[PDB]
Amino acid sequence: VFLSPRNFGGVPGTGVDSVAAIEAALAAGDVDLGGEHWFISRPIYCVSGRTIQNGKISTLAAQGSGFMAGSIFAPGNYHPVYVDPVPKLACSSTNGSATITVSSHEFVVGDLVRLSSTRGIIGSDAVLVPWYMQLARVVGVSGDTVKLDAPIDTTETLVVHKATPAGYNARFNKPLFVLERATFRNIEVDTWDYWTADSATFECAFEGIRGKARSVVYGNTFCRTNFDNIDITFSNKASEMAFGSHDTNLSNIKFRADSQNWDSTNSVGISWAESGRRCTLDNWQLLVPQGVNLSVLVRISSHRDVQIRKGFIQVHSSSNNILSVEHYGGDRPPCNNILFEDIDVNATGAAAVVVDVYKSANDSAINAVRFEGISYRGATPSVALMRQRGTTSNQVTGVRASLYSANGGAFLVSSAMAWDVRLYGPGL
């Protein structure tokens, strides 16, 4: 808002590095990029309580400079490997209660803290992905009694540590932190890389983000965060919100897949996992042009309390899987209370499966899943309009759908029961 990088020796528009200048202004105050074009040699390390707005940021780093080399911001910098060695204290906690007991804590009122379960899986980073994760602010302390600004929503045994734990480093030996109460407004990003890679946010707002990147909404530990009016041409992954993202809302989002710069290796549509809670996507388009093929457009694995609403999907390929809820069991928190509502799906090909529900294991948990107002425009699916698969002992139960498919399609069930699926033809 108030200060310019120019005031800290920053030069725009000539392809010289300004990262230090931007970071210097961020330390002093809010930052207005003057509607000019800034060039950075590495991600801007963000500052809690700051607004950055009104300009374009391009990376100077060469494609394949290494992970996060091309990134625009480190809005926080959590990655499971750097969170893993942080010492974490045992605490008592009760499902529904904002009160914990922690022997020999050093939390003060106002401190952001991270609550996590000791239950979890070893994930892609070869480290614990807790069954449950929560950032919350301390609002009271008396001896071992700590009060939080939000309840604990699990019966799981938790441990706690300072969200920003002094002495502990992350990538490029920068301190491990969560970005608090920061705002990003009217920014154009221009990178080959994740415009954010490592990240962790709490009460942050991204408003008016446009341009080109590997990704549209991608990062770790997005908490009490809003993403609004995001319109990005992406080359690999529409959205992942990993490592315990919760109470985070995406609205007015245009995921435009990049035909020229498409990277087909490990392509991801919207893929939500790593114990997310109360994450919503509302009013969005996923546009996959000719020449680009995403195998799975929207999938939820390891997310709960999810709402995906007011969606348009257009793909220019065949045999895509459109909407998917999956659970691989073990110590993955259940895929519970998932609403897909008012999704129009166009395919120039013929979808494989439009609605999929898949329990891989005897201990897989999928409950209170609804697919309401799903319109599929395209040829009769090659596998199924709608497929449910459980196991003999672990059936898919209670699933609900309203589907509008002018070319109909197969209704495949395999160890599933107690569904309620209305099919409507065109013309009301």
Author numbering: 27 to 454
Task: Show sentences the authors wrote.
Surprisingly, we collected diffraction data at 2.0 Å resolution, which produced a unit cell and space group (a = 38.3, b = 141.0, c = 81.9; β = 102.6, space group P21) not compatible with the size of the protein. Therefore, it appeared obvious that KP34gp57 had encountered some proteolytic degradation prior to crystallization. Only upon experimental structure determination using SAD did electron density maps clearly reveal two copies of the portion 27–454 in the unit cell, i.e., missing the C-terminal domain. The N-terminal region of each copy (residues 27–56) contains two α-helices, followed by the typical β-helix structure characterizing the catalytic domain of tailspikes (residues 57–102 and 204–454). In addition, a six-stranded β-barrel domain protrudes from the catalytic β-helix between residues 103–203. This crystal structure content was fully unexpected since monomeric tailspikes have hitherto never been observed and their trimeric state is believed to be crucial for enzyme stability. Indeed, we identified a large cavity in each promoter (with an area of 280.9 Å2 and a volume of 330.5 Å3), formed by both the β-helix and the β-barrel insertion domain, using the software CASTp. A clear electron density describes the catalytic pocket, thus allowing for the identification of E266 and E300 (belonging to the β-helix structure) as the most promising catalytic residues and D151 (belonging to the insertion domain) as likely assisting CPS binding. After incubation of CPS with the enzyme variants, the absorption of all samples was analyzed at 490 nm and compared with a calibration curve measured with known concentrations of glucose. This assay confirmed the crucial role of E266 and E300 in catalysis since E266Q/E300Q is fully inactive. In KP34gp57, the high resistance of this CBM to proteolysis, together with the observation of the monomeric state of KP34gp57 once deprived of the CBM, suggests that the CBM domain plays a crucial role in inducing a compact trimerization of the enzyme while still allowing for the necessary flexibility needed by the catalytic domain for enzymatic catalysis.
Virion-associated depolymerases are large trimeric and multi-domain proteins that constitute the phage arsenal to degrade the polysaccharide layers in their bacterial host. In this study, we elucidated the structural and functional features of the capsular depolymerase KP34gp57 from the Klebsiella phage KP34. The CPS depolymerase KP34gp57 is a large enzyme with a trimeric organization consisting of 630 amino acid residues per chain and an MW of the trimer of ~200 kDa. In this work, we focused on the structure and function of the CPS depolymerase KP34gp57 derived from Klebsiella phage KP34, which efficiently causes a visible halo zone on bacterial lawns of the K63 serotype of K. pneumoniae.
